[PDB]
Design a protein around this ligand. Structure first.
Ligand SMILES: [O][B]1([O])O[C][C]C2=[C][C]=[C][C]=C21
Ligand SMILES: [Zn+2]
Length: 256
């Protein structure tokens, strides 16, 4: 699977029939159809920078992984009763500034999207166990709006020159990804899925209403990563965003 014409999102259903499921992500959030929910607690993140571990080129994207052996780095509150343990963050982007987010709001496409992913350590013993369970994953989505350079991205962008090609990985330490989140953690929540294969319907989404900034030149650093292995023809990672999927009668709830 990938994002090219032949192996891309429009084709994922052939190998992953859940692609056409009832809880697929991302979605367009229509703000006139959201239900303000009075029971939603504020989101609480508490991350320890010593849990940052490694940055990895996974061919279609790059991942920043965290040590997840204990509750040093956790998400609580919002719609959750359970503590969720941080394990990774990553981005999605598009081939130009005009699109690149996965979620949209009232049909508006942003330039990129940050995913901060967690797994339910109250109910499950591992990411591998949690990843296929309806209540297994909690993911914060942040819409990234092209504008002023974002200095909070600096450690992440500076690291990419060490993982330029598929499979390269490097240590990535002493980093608290709560620094990437917007000042307001006002949010939308809905039940959905992973946004690429295996597309499990295991994610409770927390979509921030406030965007964060990113420059044109910072988005170019993402698109200059290479999907090929070292020594092959260079193939830039131009895009990795999935189109929005049908709500199929899900309710998007608003904290605000
Ligand atoms: O974009 B993704 O496929 O769906 C959101 C959750 C997640 C978490 C870790 C890696 C990938 C993904
Ligand atoms: Zn993602």
């Amino acid at each position: 699977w990938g994002y090219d014409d032949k192996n891309g999102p429009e084709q994922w259903s052939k190998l992953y029939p859940i692609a056409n499921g009832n809880n697929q992500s991302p979605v367009d959030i229509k703000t006139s159809e959201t239900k303000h929910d009075t029971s939603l607690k504020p989101i609480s993140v508490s991350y320890n920078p010593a849990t940052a571990k490694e940055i990895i080129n996974v061919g279609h994207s790059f991942h920043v992984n965290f040590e997840d052996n204990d509750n040093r780095s956790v998400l609580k509150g919002g719609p959750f009763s359970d503590s969720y343990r941080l394990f990774q963050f990553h981005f999605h982007w598009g081939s130009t500034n005009e699109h690149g987010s996965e979620h949209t709001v009232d049909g508006v496409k942003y330039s990129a999207e940050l995913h901060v992913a967690h797994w339910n350590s109250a109910k499950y013993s591992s990411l591998a166990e949690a990843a296929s369970k309806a209540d297994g994953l909690a993911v914060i989505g942040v819409l990234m709006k092209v504008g002023e350079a974002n200095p909070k991205l600096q450690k992440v962008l500076d690291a990419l020159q060490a993982i330029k090609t598929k499979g390269k990985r490097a240590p990535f330490t002493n980093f608290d990804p709560s620094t990437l989140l917007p000042s307001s953690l006002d949010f939308w929540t809905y039940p959905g899925s992973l946004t690429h294969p295996p597309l499990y319907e295991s994610v409770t989404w927390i979509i921030c209403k406030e965007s964060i900034s990113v420059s044109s030149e910072q988005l170019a650093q993402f698109r200059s990563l290479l999907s090929n292995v070292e020594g092959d023809n260079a193939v830039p990672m131009q895009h990795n965003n999935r189109p929005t999927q049908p709500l199929k009668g899900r309710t998007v709830r608003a904290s605000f």
